[PDB]
């Protein structure tokens, strides 16, 4: 096969139709399912795969207690075809408490991070073998996207960060060819803090929308040039901001270049993508905590920072039901590149005390040019019944 190039135009999008759901927590109450968090979806030429960071335990297990910690030596990247739940036959593709994966049109690249907080290692595993590695450069939790990397002509790109993720000091974009790290660019432009990027091919380049845990409730943008490794960055202009926490829509504001300084601290992994001057984006329906999930278009919301004219709203998860991380992934159609997204549906500790574990299920949606209706597709497990 040839390498992927994503050179088709982005599809027409009117909204998102339902595509997949794993039901992992409901199945966990009567079968051996893995504890996971920080899921994502990525596709090869033929199929989509679901990924997640396992906690090295099944849910109905003694080891599922205290699974709220994000970093332990036992976390591994699980990989399945999308919609096969994480049962005991699941492959652990690498040791990882942070990760990213993508298929270049010939083989899978996994970027797998593990080790001491002060001295972590990233392994670059390509076509099933370890090809390269890099050590923590700022010695304070090296970390990556928790979603798919993007490859154009076999050059895969991954955003990675260390320290408090400040700017050129801490965030680097690694350019990778068949698992070998061939180039490394410092972050450049006006994005101050950049974590957990959701990235998509935007031929000839890659575009990423990320998390700002310090200053923005607006989201950073990175444009990555694949041909000359140059980096540019800014923020999603939209006056309807997409992080959590954030201010109410009646009082929020945004800036194209700067963090908005409104509930700037903390965040959640999320996504947005341009549609000409409009932006499509998803966020938790609640402004302070990860409850519900909605997507909408903001008219001129990519270009105009005072715009709050939303249209084409969809509830994905009703405002009373838990959500979590969400991320984009791109799927090649016959004539255009479609944008799809997934939502992590986190259940258990800290917020729910019926259970000793923390785990997620997922729901997945794909962009459509057709029509679509309404629903709400939450996790749906009853923790009162599978109670400890």
């Amino acid at each position, epitope marked *: 096969a040839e390498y992927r190039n994503w050179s088709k135009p982005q599809c027409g999008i009117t909204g998102f139709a339902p595509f997949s759901k794993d039901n992992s927590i409901r199945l966990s109450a009567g079968g051996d399912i893995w504890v996971t968090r920080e899921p994502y979806v990525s596709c090869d030429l033929d199929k989509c795969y679901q990924f997640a960071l396992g906690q090295g335990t099944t849910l109905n297990n003694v080891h599922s207690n205290n699974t709220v910690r994000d970093r332990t030596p036992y976390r591994t990247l699980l990989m399945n075809e999308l919609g096969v739940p994480f049962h005991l036959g699941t492959k652990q593709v690498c040791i990882a408490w942070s990760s990213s994966s993508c298929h270049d049109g010939k083989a899978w690249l996994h970027v797998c991070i593990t080790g001491d907080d002060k001295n972590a290692t990233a392994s670059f595993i390509y076509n099933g073998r370890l090809v390269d590695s890099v050590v923590s450069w700022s010695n*304070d*939790i090296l970390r990556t996207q928790e979603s798919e990397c993007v490859c154009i002509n076999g050059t895969c790109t991954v955003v990675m960060t260390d320290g408090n993720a400040t700017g050129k000091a801490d965030t680097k974009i690694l350019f990778i060819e068949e698992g070998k790290i061939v180039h490394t660019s410092k972050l450049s432009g006006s994005a101050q803090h950049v974590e957990e990027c959701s990235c998509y091919p935007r031929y000839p380049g890659v575009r990423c929308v990320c998390r700002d845990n310090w200053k923005g409730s607006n989201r950073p943008i990175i444009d990555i040039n694949i041909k000359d490794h140059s980096i540019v960055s800014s923020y999603v202009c939209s006056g309807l901001v997409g992080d959590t926490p954030r201010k109410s829509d009646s009082s929020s504001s945004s800036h194209c270049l700067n963090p908005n300084n409104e509930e700037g601290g903390h965040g959640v992994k999320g996504w947005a993508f341009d549609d000409g001057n409009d932006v499509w984006m998803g966020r938790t329906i609640n402004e302070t905590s990860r409850l519900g999930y909605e997507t909408f278009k903001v008219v001129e919301g990519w270009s105009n920072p005072k715009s709050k004219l939303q249209i084409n709203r969809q509830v994905i998860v009703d405002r009373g039901d838990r959500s979590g991380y969400s991320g984009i992934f791109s799927v090649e159609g016959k004539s255009c590149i479609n944008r799809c997204f997934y939502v992590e549906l986190i259940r258990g500790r800290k917020e729910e005390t019926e259970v000793l574990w923390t785990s997620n299920s997922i729901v997945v949606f794909c962009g459509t040019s057709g029509t679509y209706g309404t629903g709400s597709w939450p996790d749906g497990a009853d923790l009162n019944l599978m109670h400890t």
Partner: antibody
Amino acid sequence: VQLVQSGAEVKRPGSSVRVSCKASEGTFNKYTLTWVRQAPGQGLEWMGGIIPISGIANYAQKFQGRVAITADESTTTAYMELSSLRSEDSAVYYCATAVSDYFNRDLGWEDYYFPFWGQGTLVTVAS
Amino acid sequence: EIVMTQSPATLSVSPGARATLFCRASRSVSDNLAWYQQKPGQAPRLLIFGASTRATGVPARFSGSGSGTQFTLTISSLQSEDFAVYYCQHYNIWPPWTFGQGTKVEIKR
């Protein structure tokens, strides 16, 4: 837990101070070691702290570039070094244990409150 | 940055009487809220954490209550020890771990 600090200081402006805090042995494996200051009638302010096991340090936005916090396990002594001392840095500096002992890169910090405190070191910044 | 604020700035009370100190947060801090007592010329002393859990050695006359944006510390009967400055502090999710500017509890003439 006992925390014992260095005696009082007077420093010229533009210089640096290095307050010390000696703990009960093994404190830096159980608690974050935190520095908090109090300008003499103004209010308490957190400066930063150093987290157990990994020993990574975290600083309040206004002190970044000006403060360093380090800890020697062997003497079980933590140090706070504050630099480019302005007259406004005249304060009592306390070390304290925070119950917080793990930073979740997604979910932040639990239990960052202060059960045990040092006796406080007065630092005066004057000509 | 969450702003803690306290009222009243000074609370004048008769010895043996009940006192209530109010602390209000500019955003929801769940129950991630602590109270400290500071006497003149001493380090602060933790009284309450989780908005309501009494810390070790703290006598039962201290009681904390509230959630979200509003909290109370109740001192059920002021003994001569209890005339001090009281600080609230949030510890909700993310720094800075801001303190209130403190309330003085003061003997009525």
